[PDB]
Amino acid sequence: ALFKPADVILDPKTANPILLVSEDQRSVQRAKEPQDLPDNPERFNWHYCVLGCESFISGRHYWEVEVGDRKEWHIGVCSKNVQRKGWVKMTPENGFWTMGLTDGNKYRTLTEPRTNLKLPKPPKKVGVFLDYETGDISFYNAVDGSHIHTFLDVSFSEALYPVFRILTLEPTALTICP
Amino acid sequence: EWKKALFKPADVILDPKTANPILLVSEDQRSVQRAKEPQDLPDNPERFNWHYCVLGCESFISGRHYWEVEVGDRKEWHIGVCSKNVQRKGWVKMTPENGFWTMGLTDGNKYRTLTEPRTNLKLPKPPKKVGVFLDYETGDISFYNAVDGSHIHTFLDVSFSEALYPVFRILTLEPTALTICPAL
Amino acid sequence: RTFLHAVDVVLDPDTAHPDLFLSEDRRSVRRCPFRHLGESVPDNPERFDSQPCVLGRESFASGKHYWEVEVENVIEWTVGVCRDSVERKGEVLLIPQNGFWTLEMHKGQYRAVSSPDRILPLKESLCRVGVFLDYEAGDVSFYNMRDRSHIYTCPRSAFSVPVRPFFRLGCEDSPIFICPALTGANGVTVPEEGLTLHR
Amino acid sequence: RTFLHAVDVVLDPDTAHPDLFLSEDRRSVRRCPFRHLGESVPDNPERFDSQPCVLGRESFASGKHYWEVEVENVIEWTVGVCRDSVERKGEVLLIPQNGFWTLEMHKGQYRAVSSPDRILPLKESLCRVGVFLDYEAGDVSFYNMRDRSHIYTCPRSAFSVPVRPFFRLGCEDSPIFICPALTGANGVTVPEEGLTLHRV
Ligand code: DMA
Ligand code: DMA
């Protein structure tokens, strides 16, 4: 505990209409088809994304996401002022600091350009560390303690929200550990 | 003929407020051509928004009337009268039951009465000028070859309870316009 | 509001005659007679009980709409459009006056508006058929999507009520496929070099 | 904006390189090289002058749109979508960085985004190609309309400005035909028995 454990709750007002936030707002799954929801300004209307309710303005914070054996997922943080309407590339320059899994076994960092990651173990549970001031975001296997990736000395000028993205319709949800 | 002389020559002027946007009414309001594509016009209640139709400005409410239409060698045209109250928005079958009494030409040489069902007319000579005779009280509109005087077609089932406008329809894009002869 | 809409057609299982067997994605259907043998099928008012028919879940009350159907190696089929209000129960004639606008394959021949008096003289086996609606025009038209050639427009009809995609199968174990609307890379990661030959 | 729009593509003669010869209906185009030999051709800022290109007159700032192109007569060609603001006078690479999203046939090969490093391994000659635009998605995609199979989606791009249908002929004498949108019996008398095998 070098870093304050954040208590992260999914903001249903931000969830793409194809996403289903649980009753307890800790887990998200994909619908077969979009729900009939309004296109309020907070809602990601293109990317299959959902934010936390609370954003980070300073200090050091940590949370954990259960990915299970889900074939596809990306998680990390984004700026308050990212583009929520239409596609934007999820990259540092557009205000997104994320990594994840695609196609069952391809781990990437959503950098400009993307980079492949060599992971000895595939993670079932991921830890995300943010240091607003130094400007550092790090991903770890939550079980092994094994490193995954770090963005270094970033110059954050806005509040940062936790962000979760799933494209695939599978039975394993994405679950925030309380 | 004494009978011809019962019919008042009507002065028929095309009403641009009624013309489907793909129609061009001339300066003098006597002639109609097709544009390649609809013009940017309002869909005001008077305008035919589906059928390529235009009405005269004056409707008939009584008496006997005659007008003449230059078709020349146009390969597609239909003319006659319709009720004030016809459907102007969306396709409707142009037939007596929907308030249209019209005949004309399609495909260069297929003359029809626009009734239900349509009938192929025999025209020993193709007309270049068509005389139109309306007798409001006998619910009659008769079509003639205005040059050689020969009869083309008669409806004896015209509304005598509705105002009747001359109506003119062209589907094709071709050199010859459809032209009303002014009353003279 | 003059745009041709390329419809994404999904079958409405509630309409489907019990012998009709829909795929789970509801974009394909075959006819398997007496497949409910030994079962009591609830006979909800939306379901066709005699005609082996199924409708698309879409309704149209306006504008221009089309979709494509794969009919290769199906010996008995009907496609087209019908009023939402058509008779579901009994042996209704599938004709414009009863609210049906159809193209049919029947005994090796193509028939407009399911009429034995309107055999269409096609010079090839249809494989992919276009179904076209222009509501305000009273227009239901059929196309051969091999060369995008016109096949047939039904007599112009006042639809009056919303209309829906219409399907019939008159043979066994022979599926038709409704061609999904193109979606591009919708729901899929696109690599920075592009996405190639997606399936 | 839910709806997939099947576009009726009509070429804009003001965009057309002078060697391009449009059909009267403006739904097909062939290249007739140096066909203005001995002529002075007037200046027109809309006209592509370095490469034999022509745009659809339609432009899209949102929504989903597609059209089909018959390419079976032609083996030196480019099709897809470009920004309305692309360079018209100078020669540019027909790549996303310059505001072009293209499928190309060049020297017997299909090249994605006109790139010698993006040879598409197709097993058949393309006859009818679907060009698909999803503006919000940054998506230009190409389909083989024989079996409606996916060929290629270009890298996702922020279009930013209105985009237009894009066509080009290379060392080629044969025409491209743009498949008109289906119109049913629009503009035509439908007999009371129906209209059978209408030919335009
Ligand atoms: C919702 C969705 C289909 C996102 C994929 O985004 P992308 O194509 O830009 O790919 P990625 O961010 O996975 O590299
Ligand atoms: C504008 C147009 C395409 C009209 C034809 O109407 P229709 O098909 O009802 O035929 P007609 O009235 O000539 O019998």
Residue numbers in the entry:
A (entry chain D): 305 to 482
B (entry chain C): 301 to 484
C (entry chain B): 322 to 520
D (entry chain A): 322 to 521
What does the paper say about this structure?
Vγ9Vδ2 T cells—a major subtype of human circulating γδ T cells—respond to multiple cancers and infectious diseases in an MHC-independent manner; they are specifically activated by small, non-peptidic diphosphate metabolites called pAgs. The sensing of pAgs in target cells requires a surface protein, BTN3A112–17, that has both intracellular and extracellular domains. Here we show how—in both humans and alpaca—multiple pAgs function as ‘molecular glues’ to promote heteromeric association between the intracellular domains of BTN3A1 and the structurally similar butyrophilin BTN2A1. The BTN3A1–pAg complex functions as a composite interface that directly binds to BTN2A1, bridged by the pAg molecule at the centre of the interface.
We next tested the ability of DMAPP and IPP, which are accumulated in tumorigenesis, to initiate the BTN3A1–BTN2A1 association. ITC analysis indicated that BTN3A1 B30.2 alone has a weaker binding affinity for DMAPP (120 μM) and IPP (658 μM) than for HMBPP (1.64 μM). However, both DMAPP and IPP promote the association between BTN3A1 and BTN2A1 B30.2, albeit to differing extents (KD = 12.3 μM and 155 μM, respectively). However, in contrast to HMBPP, DMAPP does not form hydrogen bonds with the His351 and Tyr352 residues of BTN3A1 due to the absence of a 1-OH group. Mutations in BTN2A1 B30.2 that disrupted Vγ9Vδ2 T cell activation by HMBPP also impaired activation by zoledronate. Collectively, these findings demonstrate that DMAPP and IPP act as molecular glues to drive γδ T cell activation.
